[PDB]
């Protein structure tokens, strides 16, 4: 009973230890995933900016086209 008890305690100690190691690994993977996520956000962000400039250009061009069609009618 006693020997099994001490061994049980040391067992729980080891289990908790390796558990914490697993935690370290998991928060590392989380860390990296987060980093690359942010990178993707920057890239896609600049892409969205280019999209906006595209929309503005379209608007101005179609404004001019509207002008020409009103000058033709």
């Amino acid at each position: 009973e006693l020997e099994e008890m001490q061994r049980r305690a040391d067992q729980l100690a080891d289990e908790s230890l390796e558990s914490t190691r697993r935690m370290l690994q998991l928060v590392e993977e989380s860390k990296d995933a987060g980093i690359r996520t942010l990178v993707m956000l920057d890239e896609q962000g600049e892409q969205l900016d280019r999209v906006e400039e595209g929309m503005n250009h379209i608007n101005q061009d179609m404004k001019e086209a509207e002008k020409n069609l009103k000058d033709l009618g």
Binding site: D10, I35, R36, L38, V39, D42, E43, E46
Partner: protein, 280 residues
């Protein structure tokens, strides 16, 4: 080629201590004048280098016999993940004692129960590794048309301790060099008391497409104390006259335009780096 080493190993379960006996060594190469060296063996537990044990110095023999014994008061549970190191040194009275050989024994391969005693061939000790052991990660983005260089300092890790009895106070300084001259100067926020500082801070530089192959980007991680000169932890550079993973990251930035590529880099000493930057 130096020679072999006969040693003994066993564990006393009655006192819960490791009994390591250094028997002898043979066919050791001669490094001294007389045609024979002055050997002595340093033995210590491989896991933690504490309380290393040294044998007596034998004069002028390439086959020294020590027949000595050392005791490591270590429990049997901790023993399994502990290794043994036996390194043969050559004594010299007027200089550094050169290492002749070394040998490492994993305690998970060792079988206790019968008294072990064997001959093992000595090997050449591994050279000392880099001291810093820190790393800085950032992203590079260059679009050739507008000539914009976007350097985003992401995060550093495993930085060298700079403060007394605690963590460091790191901050990133970015220099842009050309022909040895430091043009632009930028820096980040100061993250206090951190083993791994997270910044996520973007910087932009005006770099024409005609000079892209003649620019130097210098990233430096430094420590911040209010009083006095602020020391430097590490620094790396990418671009003109760069080598390694640095030139790789640079080439990835070039090959991938309108897109930021994030990468890690190993911190080098400022002396060698600045010596490289003074080139051409």
């Amino acid at each position: 080629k130096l020679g072999k080493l006969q040693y003994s190993l066993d564990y006393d379960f009655q006192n819960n201590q490791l009994l390591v006996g250094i028997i002898q060594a043979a066919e050791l190469p001669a490094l001294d004048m007389g045609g024979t060296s002055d050997p002595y063996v340093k033995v210590f537990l491989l896991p933690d280098k504490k309380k290393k044990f040294e044998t007596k110095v034998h004069r002028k023999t390439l086959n020294p016999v020590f027949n000595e014994q050392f005791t490591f008061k270590v429990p049997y549970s901790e023993l399994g993940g502990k290794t043994l190191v036996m390194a043969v040194y050559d004594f010299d009275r007027f200089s550094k004692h050169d290492i002749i050989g070394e040998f490492k024994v994993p305690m998970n391969t060792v079988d206790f129960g019968h008294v072990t005693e064997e001959w093992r061939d000595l090997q050449s000790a591994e050279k000392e590794e880099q001291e810093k052991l820190g790393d800085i990660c950032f992203s590079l983005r260059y679009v050739p048309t507008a000539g914009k260089l976007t350097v985003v300092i992401l995060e550093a890790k495993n930085l060298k301790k700079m403060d007394v009895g605690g963590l460091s106070d790191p901050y990133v300084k970015i220099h842009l060099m050309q022909n040895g001259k430091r043009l632009k100067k930028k820096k980040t926020t100061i993250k206090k008391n951190t083993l791994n500082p997270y910044y996520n801070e973007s910087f932009s530089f005006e770099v024409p497409f005609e000079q892209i192959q003649k620019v130097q980007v210098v990233v430096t991680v430094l420590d911040y104390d209010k009083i006095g000169k602020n020391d430097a932890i590490g620094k790396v550079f990418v671009g003109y006259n760069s080598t390694g993973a640095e030139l790789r990251h640079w080439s990835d930035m070039l090959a991938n335009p309108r897109r930021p590529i994030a990468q890690w880099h190993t911190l080098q000493v400022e002396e060698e780096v600045d010596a490289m930057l003074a080139v051409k």
